[PDB]
Every structure is written in C-alpha cells, then in structure tokens.
Amino acid sequence: VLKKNPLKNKQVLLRLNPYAKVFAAEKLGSKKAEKTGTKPAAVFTETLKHD
Amino acid sequence: GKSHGYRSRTRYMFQRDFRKHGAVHLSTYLKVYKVGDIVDIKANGSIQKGMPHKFYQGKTGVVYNVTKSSVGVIINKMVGNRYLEKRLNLRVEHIKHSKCRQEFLERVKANAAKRAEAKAQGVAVQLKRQPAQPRESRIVSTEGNVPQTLAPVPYETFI
Amino acid sequence: MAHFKEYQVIGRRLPTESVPEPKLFRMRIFASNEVIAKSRYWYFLQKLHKVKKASGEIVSINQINEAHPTKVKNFGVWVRYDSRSGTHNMYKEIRDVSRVAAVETLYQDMAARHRARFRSIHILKVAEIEKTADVKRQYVKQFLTKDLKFPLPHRVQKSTKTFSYKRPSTFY
Amino acid sequence: AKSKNHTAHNQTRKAHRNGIKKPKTYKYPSLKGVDPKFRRNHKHALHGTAKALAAAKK
Amino acid sequence: GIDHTSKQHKRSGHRTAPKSDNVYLKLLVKLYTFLARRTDAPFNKVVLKALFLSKINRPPVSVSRIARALKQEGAANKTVVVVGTVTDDARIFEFPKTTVAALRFTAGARAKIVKAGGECITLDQLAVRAPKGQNTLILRGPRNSREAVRHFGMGPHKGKAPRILSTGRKFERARGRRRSKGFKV
Amino acid sequence: AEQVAAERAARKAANKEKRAIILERNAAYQKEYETAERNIIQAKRDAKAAGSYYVEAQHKLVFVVRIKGINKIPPKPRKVLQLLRLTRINSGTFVKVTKATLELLKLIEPYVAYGYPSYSTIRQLVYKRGFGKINKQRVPLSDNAIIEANLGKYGILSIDDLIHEIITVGPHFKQANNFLWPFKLSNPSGGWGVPRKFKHFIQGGSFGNREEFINKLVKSMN
RNA sequence: AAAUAUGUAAGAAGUCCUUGUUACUUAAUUGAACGUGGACAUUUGAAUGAAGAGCUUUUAGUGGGCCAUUUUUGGUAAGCA
RNA sequence: GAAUACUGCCAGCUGGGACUGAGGACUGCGACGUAAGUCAAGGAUGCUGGCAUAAUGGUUAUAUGCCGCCCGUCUUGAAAC
Ligand SMILES: [Mg+2]
Ligand SMILES: [Mg+2]
Ligand SMILES: [Mg+2]
Ligand SMILES: [Mg+2]
C-alpha cells in the first residue's frame, strides 16, 4: 500500500539485499587500500611538464 | 499552361553517362531473372521501349512475371496514406539484380556452414550480426612515439 | 569557465593495418573540465590535421598543476581572436601566480576591452617571462620597481545595516 | 477575390495520423498479369501433382 | 505533459456483455462467466464470447452443416455446439444420431434430430455434462453470405452489387457498365 | 492440523535457502566490482611506470534523461525519444552503447542530458525509483520475489542481480532494461547549475554528453 | 560532385538434400513453377520500441486559412503576393 | 617524507524545520532474539489541556492584496473605431 525507500528504513534495506548486514559489519564502504610505490616513467613526467 | 507529360523532368535522369553512350553490352541480355528475384530499376535512355516511368527510377522491386524480352516487377508506391501495389512491364536493359540480395544469400550460406561446423565442435556459434561495439582497453607505448605537438597557429593573410 | 584548469590531452588517429602506432599528438588546453578539454582538443586537431573525433582516439588526459603556485610571475600571452570584421593576433602581459589564473584574467580582459567571447579566442602561447627588461608592457613594468608601495585612498566600508548614526569616513 | 492555390501543408500529418500501411503480402499471390502460357501449363501441372498425391496417400 | 504514443482512454472495442435484455441469456452468460473464470478450458472462454454476439454475427447453422461436420474423421461421436440457432434443411435425406447443443432449435431442426435419434440440448445442460468442453465441436454459420455484404466495397472494378431497388433492363446497365455505352466500369 | 503449519514451515525453508543464495551472489558481485576497480587503477599505474598510456575501455552503458518538454519537437527526434521510452520531461533510461544507439543519441542531443552512470548512481536509482513492467503495469519492485517471478528465467533473482545486469552489460541486458519501467525523476534539487539549459553541456548549457557529470545531475534529480 | 532527404534487404511463406506433376521449355532424363519425404534449436539469422495486433461497416464536421525558423519565386519594397 | 585542496564513494553517525497519516480482524517479506516472543517489517499511534459554543465552521455584506476588457456571432484574426 505504500512504497518504502531503501537507502533509508534499514528494515526494508535488509529485506532486500541480505548482504547489507555484512557490508555494514565489515565497513566495506571504508576499505583501506594496499599501498604501492610504483613510480611514473621519466618520459611520462617530461611529457606532462613539456611546454 | 503547365506540362505533366510522361517524361517531364527527366532531362538528366535519362542521360547516358559520360562517354558511355552507344549500344548496350551483352551481359545485360545474358543475365537471367526468375520470379522472386529482387531487382533495381535504372532506365537506359537509349532503349525507349519498355522504359519505366520516372517515379520508378531507383526503386527496387520483386519479379513476378517473365516474358520474352521483359520482366514484370512489383513496386510498392506511396499513394495518399497507404502503399499500393504497382506492376511494371520492363525490358531487361532497365533492370539489374540487387547486390544486397546476392550478399544476403551468401550470408545465408555462411550461416548454414557455421551452424553445421558448430554442430560438430564449438557449440553456440552465435549466428546474429552485432553493431559496432565500444573499444576494449589498450596500452599505447611511447617507445619511438614520444607525444610532441604544438599549439593553434597565429592568423596570417596569405594574400 | 573562469575557474580554469590546464589539461594535457594526448590523442592519435585510430590504428589501422597499414599504419599501426600513430604519432600521438599532444596539446595543452585551458578548460573548466575534462569534457570541454577533450572537445577543444578535437576542435584544434580538426583544424590543424586531417583527423576528426570519429576517426581518432584520446589516449590520455591529465591535469597539469602549477609548479610554484605561490610565486608571482609575469606571463607573456600570444592570442589569436576574431573581431566583428576580421581576425587579429595580440600579445599581452599578465602578472599573476599561475597559468590558469593568468588565462582567466586574459579571457576577462579580452571580453572587457574587445567584446571577444571564449568562442572567438585561440590561445596561441602562454610563457613565463624569465627576467625583467624583457617585460614590454608598461602596465606590467610599473609594478616591478624597487620597494614598490602605494596607498589605497578613499576606502569605502560596507555597512551591514540600512541606517548609520556616524557619518562614515574614508580614511585608510 | 483570389484564394490560396495549393499547398501540401498538413498532408503528411494527416497521412501519418492513421499511419502509412504496407500492402499485406500473401502466400500464393494472384496470377493476374502472369504469362497465359505459363498459367495454362501450371494448371495441368497442379492437376497432375494432386492426382499423384491422391494416388499415393489414398 | 506526456508525449502520448497511443490514443488515451480507448475502449477495448469488444462486447463485454450481451446487448439484449433476455434474462435467460443473461443467466447463461453468468454461468459461462463463472466457468471461464474458474476453469482453464478455452472452450468456456470461446462460448462466453460467442454469447455476446449480435444476430448478424451469429448466423444460423443448418443441420446439413452439422451432418457435414460430423462426417469429419473422428468427429462422429462429438457434441456439436452452436451458439445460436440451428435451422432445418430438406436438401439432406439422411441424418446421423448425435447430440447438438444450441441456443435455439427451429421446429424442423429439432424434429429432424430427434427423429434421427439424437437429442437437442441447451447450453446449461452442455455445461453440466461437459464443464471443460470435452469432446465438443463448435460450429459457426456463414457470416459473409448475408445480403448486406454484397454491397460492401462498391466501386470501380471491385465487382460488388450496387445498392438498387428495381432490377432489370433500364436499371443501371448502361453507360458505365459496357463499352458500347461510354465505358465499362 | 488441517495442513497449514507443514507448508508454512516448508515455505520458510524455501525462503531461507533462497536468501542464502542471494547473499552469496551479492558477496560475489561485491568482490567482482572491487577487483575490476583495483585492476583498472593498477593498470593505469603500471602503464605510467612502463612509460605507456593505459587507454581505459570505452564506456558500455549510458543513462539518458529527457530534459525538454513535449511541445514543438521535430518528428524524427520525437520518434527516437519514443523508442527510447522518454515520453515526458525528466524521464530516464539506460542504454547500452553501440553504433546503432550512439546515432540515436546524436540525433536527440538537444533534448536529453546523458552520460556514464556509476554503480552508486545505478544502485540508488533502482532502489528508490525502480519499477517493473508486469502485465503492462508499473509495479514497485520493493521485493525480490517480484524480480524472480518476472526475470528468474534469465538467472536474475534479486534487485542486486538486476543492478549487476545493468552496470555490467550482460547477455540479458535488453530484457532486464525493458523490464525496468522508465525512471521518473524530479527536477534537480540544487538546480541545473546553468542559467540556460538548452545549450550543449560543452557550451555552458545542459544537453548532450556530460560523461561523468551525469552522476551528479541524476543524484540531485532523484 | 556533397550534406540532408529517398528505394530495397537483414529468412520458417527460410535454406539445403533426394525425387514427383505438366499440355510450358530444352538437343536432351534441360529447365521453370508447384510439390511428397528428410535435415536445420531456441542468438529463426542486426538495434530499439511495440502503448494489444489485424479487419470491416457506417456516418459528422471540413473543403476561406494564417504565423515562425530554414529553402525559395515575383516585386525597390511591404504587417505584399 | 608528509599534509591539505579538488573530485568521488560509504548497505557511516547524528541535530533542526515543513507537508502528509491514505487503509481498517489475520494472511506477506523481513529484522532482533537459543527458543518465548518482540519490532521503525503489506499506510498513526500514545499521553495531555481548553472549550462544548457561534468558539471552529458555513452563508452573506464590506475592507485589504493580487488578478479580471462585453456577451452572442461571422472571421486567419474581436474588448474592438
Ligand atoms: Mg481553396
Ligand atoms: Mg533551493
Ligand atoms: Mg466556406
Ligand atoms: Mg488588472
């Protein structure tokens, strides 16, 4: 009789998509990424800075 | 007064092409037409018998009748709010086979060949054609191709 | 629009069998966003070479930030623009702390003095002037003098209220 | 007292308001205008084909 | 605003009920409405729709037509269903024993079926003995043999009957109908 | 004991195992999206390190919003808007990108704003304004059983299966998209950002392709 | 020699394999047309949409038009034609 | 070697304001709970105060703010000088 919006009303959000509980529990919206230290090539940097 | 004769406004459409006048080459008369063939209409101005009316220039139809020197062609014509069926008796000089239909029949043969090969190995041969797809990812190397280009040019007269 | 960014846009012709690995043409484009940057790139490649967006490709777009945003520089700017009855080349000098800000000022100034819209202007070249005595415009040279200092006479203070009880002064 | 002579204004809109319809092809088109010799022979060909089919199926 | 692709508020164009006020027809309609709703047999839906039809849309079905239909292979024992009138036919001299369910039987048709040994049945008895239209055979009369249809589509070269009161010579058989008098059609 | 509790227990068991299937499918979708995103980022970084340029794959999905009213439209664009199911202003649809649809968009440029939607935009659009076309009726989704009843023949069992079929242009994209009723969006909450809408986005207007800024526009529109 | 506009096709009434009819056709057991029987799977042969699709009867009003962008004729031009 | 801006994401948290409360036994999908149950989960309930009549409200006259050209007709076009 009345459309209830998910993205609010977490009861309806959980009725759909049972994975929202795991998402919220593990904070998958705030996932820290693994660090990497690869460096751009000197040709790339020189091309970027070129006039 | 006005003038709406049979060949009015056909001055250029019934031209022979440039340096292409004279007699018709024999392959035109050696072509074979059967009932159901799809043909294009292009009037030859040097042949005044069996010529189509200017409306049917560039129209494509279906053969329904074969006579001694002519072919009956069915053309759907726009009259008012509906299409009417029109039957033309045209000599073979004004008719050529539709290359589109020839290539479609070739595609039918190739589709059968692919399906039969997939019947042995490689199931789901995916007969249907597809529209051009967006490009996939790619890597563009700079080795020997360093990006280097200049800016827009200043104005100058060249006069 | 006037919040300009500078992008390098690198593109090329679509590779074929006869000529794989085309030549990767690159431009520097002042634009408010990447969509406009890519469009301006294709407009200029369209005008200079026999290539268009359909038969081409954008391989890279990168924002170029100012090296020293807090260093006051003098910029020579060569532009080509369309007036109401012709096309003209101009040279102008802007004292500013970044290329995008200098180009912003240039567009405002062209709009103000020559009624030239962004539509009508080609930025031929923006280059920092490395030292004084090469600055050619007096409206920029006058700010390069030693121990420069000037007052700001007739200061007008904005009132937060409709009525004032004190007959304001303009000292400063 | 002259009036407008001619115009095709609104004519395409009128033609399309009940749409433009194709002529609804059938299987077995009418043999009108077909060569009389071919039609005359085709009658006997169909007669013989039906006779042979009846003699086979029974 | 909506860019409408089809006409709005368009009625379906099909009858949802009989146009008549026959109370017994309305009782038959409510019976077959219940059957068409509570059964998956398409026979009940077909009979229900036929119960709405007008008189020109339910032409009479002759007993000769019924006998010819019963001559079909494997249809000798089926129940013939005519949603309409079954008329008599004297062109036939033999009639099989069969069950015919119809809205109306003429006196001759009913007498011929009963004499042949069969029975004439109303649609409610048909519904009782075949709730799903089991072993039925729905027959329809010739719709386009109506006299009004001859004049439909009158025009040049259409080959239809002109709408005319008196026939014979002097009545539309002159200029326009023969080459010797102007033109032919 | 009129045989009520038995089938109620069986129905609850069926629901529980169905939800377990949905849960594992959604976990797989989440890991697939995370892997695709990180692989794209790392491919860009590796091309930079090697001195090359990583040209990302051309976008496969566009979201199109009709921004012009229904009066005074030439017949050809009017027909294309009808075929794209944009029959009123602020209506939106998903279109998979081919040459055949790029020509359609290029033919209706002045009346639409379209771009490349993100996963967040697609998910919020379907969750809040997603309606199914069932028996020619507009039905609020609001439940996975509706989706499994109307698209379960394609292996689409939940709203997240539907979203996956949209964001990744899958084999049954056409069926899933046509099942989705055209989204009816409100006017943008912070306005259009421009004084005049009916110029191209490049020229300071609102129509045409605004590739990644369609996300901001649609988010404010719903 | 464009742009725009415009015809046709993108299959089951289809394709392939054997062999049946004829008074037409062939030098001919050659063809033509229409067929019996057999094979082709679900991507049955591009995209998008399809609001139900087709079919018929009958009858109203109307048959003075005018405006705008663009193309365009007469005219110096016109809120002109 | 960091920081921050810009852009983007979170099925992160939370404060203030406005409009609405359609339906009327139960049935569904969920959630939290070992279960028993409970719940914001197929549309508002709980507690409290004043009045119980011209108080609310209706009608009517007037005032104020903004808006409102005379109908019918012929006409491309009518408030028409
Ligand atoms: Mg007239
Ligand atoms: Mg606001
Ligand atoms: Mg009149
Ligand atoms: Mg007023």
Amino acid (1-letter code) at residue E19: K
- Nearest alpha-carbon partner for F116 in F63, F182, F164: F63
Contact A51 C10 (CB under 8 A): no
Whether the CB of F49 is below 8 Å from some CB of chain B: the reply is no
State the DSSP code for F50: H
- Nearest alpha-carbon partner for A16 in C14, F141, B71: F141
F32 touches strand H (CB under 7 A): no
Q: Distance between CA atoms of F108 and F207, rounded to whole angstroms?
A: 10
CB contacts, 8 Å: F82 with chain E:
3, 5
Q: From ligand 2's centre to the CA of F191, what distance in Å? A: 8
Helix (H) and strand (E) counts in chain B: 2, 6
Q: Which of F41, F42, F45, F53 to mutate to test the interface with B (most CBs of B within 10 A)?
A: F53
51-110 of chain F touching strand G, CB 7 A cut-off: 76, 82-85, 87, 96, 98, 100-101
Q: How far is residue C13 from each of residues B96, B144, B148, C35, F112, measured CA to CA in Å? A: 39, 16, 14, 19, 29
Ligand number nearest to the C-alpha of D1: 1
Q: How far is B144 from chain F (nearest CA, A)?
A: 11
D31 touches strand G (CB under 7 A): no
Q: Distance between CA atoms of E175 and E182, rounded to whole angstroms?
A: 5
Q: Look at strands E119-121 and E99-105 and give their pairing.
A: parallel
Contact E3 F78 (CB under 8 A): yes
Residue with CA nearest G11 C1'?
Answer: B108
Burial of E26 (0-12, 13-18, 19+ CB in 10 A): middle
B115 touches strand G (CB under 7 A): yes
- Nearest alpha-carbon partner for C102 in C133, C129, C142: C129
CB atoms near residue E99 (< 10 Å): 20
Beta-carbon-side half-sphere exposure of residue A15 (alpha carbons within 13 Å): 14
Cα–Cα–Cα angle for F205, F127, A19, rounded to 5 degrees:
130
What tokens appear for E61 in the block? 């079905």
Ligand number nearest to the C-alpha of D2: 1
State the DSSP code for C143: T
Q: From ligand 4's centre to the CA of B41, what distance in Å? A: 69
CB atoms near residue C171 (< 10 Å): 7
State the DSSP code for E151: G
A21 touches strand H (CB under 7 A): yes
Ligand number nearest to the C-alpha of D5: 1
Q: Distance between CA atoms of F95 and F109, rounded to whole angstroms?
A: 14
Q: How far is F177 from chain C (nearest CA, A)?
A: 27
Burial of F170 (0-12, 13-18, 19+ CB in 10 A): middle
Cα–Cα–Cα angle for C121, C125, C131, rounded to 5 degrees:
135
Q: Give residue limits of the domains in chain E.
A: 14-145
| Sign of the dihedral through C-alpha C13, C15, C17, C21 | positive
CB contacts, 8 Å: C47 with chain B:
152
Ligand number nearest to the C-alpha of D4: 1
Q: Distance between CA atoms of F52 and F166, rounded to whole angstroms?
A: 32
Q: Look at strands E99-105 and E79-87 and give their pairing.
A: parallel
CB atoms near residue F84 (< 10 Å): 21
Burial of C78 (0-12, 13-18, 19+ CB in 10 A): middle
CB contacts, 8 Å: D21 with chain B:
81-83
Contact F45 A15 (CB under 8 A): no
Angle between helix axes F99-107 and F75-83 (nearest 10 degrees) is 130
Q: How far is residue C64 from each of residues A48, A51, C67, C100, measured CA to CA in Å? A: 7, 11, 9, 10
CA–centroid distance for C143 within its chain: 21
Judge whether F176 and F87 are in contact, CB under 8 Å.
Answer: no
CB contacts, 8 Å: A50 with chain C:
26
Nearest to E1 among F70, F78, F82 (CB): F70
CA–centroid distance for C21 within its chain: 33
Query: What subunits touch chain D, counting only 3 or more CB pairs under 8 A?
Result: B
Helices within C20-73 (DSSP H only): 34-48
Q: How far is F52 from chain B (nearest CA, A)?
A: 4
| CATH code given to domain E14-145 | 3.100.10.10
Burial of E83 (0-12, 13-18, 19+ CB in 10 A): buried
CB contacts, 8 Å: F88 with chain E:
1-3
Angle between helix axes F5-50 and F159-167 (nearest 10 degrees) is 20
Residues in chain F: 222
List Cβ neighbours of B128 (8 Å cut-off, separation of 6 or more): none
Q: Distance between CA atoms of B99 and C142, rounded to whole angstroms?
A: 77
State which nucleotides on strand G lie below 7 Å from a protein beta carbon.
5-11, 13-16, 20-25, 32-36, 40-58, 64-67, 81
- Nearest alpha-carbon partner for A41 in F39, F54, F46: F46
Determine which helix (DSSP H) or strand (DSSP E) holds F79, and give its type and residue range. helix F75-83
11-30 of chain B touching strand G, CB 7 A cut-off: none
D46 touches strand G (CB under 7 A): yes
Q: Which of F196, F202, F206, F215 to mutate to test the interface with C (most CBs of C within 10 A)?
A: F202
Say how far A14 CA is from H37 C1', in Å. 21
Mark B89-108 as b/e (b = at least 16 C-beta within 10 Å): ebbbbbbeeeeebeeeeeee
- Residue B123, phi-psi category: left (phi > 0), alpha (psi -120 to 50), beta (remainder): beta
CA–centroid distance for D39 within its chain: 17
Q: Distance between CA atoms of C23 and B149, rounded to whole angstroms?
A: 9
Local structure of E126: helix, strand or coil = helix
CA–centroid distance for C118 within its chain: 11
Nearest to F48 among A15, A23, A44 (CB): A44
Say how far D6 CA is from G79 C1', in Å. 23
F18 touches strand H (CB under 7 A): yes
Amino acid (1-letter code) at residue E4: H
Whether the CB of E6 is below 8 Å from some CB of chain F: the reply is no
What tokens appear for E117 in the block? 């040994």
CB atoms near residue E27 (< 10 Å): 11
Judge whether C116 and C110 are in contact, CB under 8 Å.
Answer: yes
164-193 of chain F touching strand H, CB 7 A cut-off: none
Q: Distance between CA atoms of E51 and E26, rounded to whole angstroms?
A: 9
Q: How far is residue B81 from each of residues B78, D9, D15, D16, measured CA to CA in Å? A: 7, 15, 4, 7
Burial of D34 (0-12, 13-18, 19+ CB in 10 A): middle
Q: DSSP of C94-128, one letter per residue?
A: EEESSHHHHHHHHHHHHHHHH---GGGEEEEEEEE
Local structure of E33: helix, strand or coil = helix
Local structure of E46: helix, strand or coil = helix
Query: Whose C1' is closest to the CA of A13: which nucleotide?
Result: H11
Determine which helix (DSSP H) or strand (DSSP E) holds B60, and give its type and residue range. strand B60-66
Local structure of E56: helix, strand or coil = coil
CB contacts, 8 Å: E4 with chain F:
87
120-139 of chain F touching strand H, CB 7 A cut-off: 120-121, 123-124
CB atoms near residue F8 (< 10 Å): 10
Name the residue of chain B whose CA is nearest to D25's CA: B85
CA–centroid distance for B11 within its chain: 23
Q: From ligand 1's centre to the CA of D15, what distance in Å? A: 20
Ligand number nearest to the C-alpha of F220: 2
Query: What subunits touch chain E, counting only 3 or more CB pairs under 8 A?
Result: F
Q: Distance between CA atoms of F208 and C60, rounded to whole angstroms?
A: 22
Q: From ligand 1's centre to the CA of B55, what distance in Å? A: 28
Nearest to F55 among C1, C36, C59 (CB): C59
Q: Distance between CA atoms of B33 and B94, rounded to whole angstroms?
A: 13
Q: Distance between CA atoms of A16 and A18, rounded to whole angstroms?
A: 6
Judge whether B137 and F43 are in contact, CB under 8 Å.
Answer: yes
State which nucleotides on strand H lie below 7 Å from a protein beta carbon.
7-12, 22-23, 28-32, 39-43
Q: Which of C10, C29, C33, C35 to mutate to test the interface with F (most CBs of F within 10 A)?
A: C35
Query: What subunits touch chain C, counting only 3 or more CB pairs under 8 A?
Result: A, B, F
Judge whether E61 and E55 are in contact, CB under 8 Å.
Answer: no
Q: From ligand 4's centre to the CA of F110, what distance in Å? A: 38
Edge-to-edge strand ranges of the sheet holding B70-79 = B82-91, B70-79, B60-66, B38-41, B95-97
Judge whether F169 and B130 are in contact, CB under 8 Å.
Answer: no
Contact B145 C24 (CB under 8 A): yes
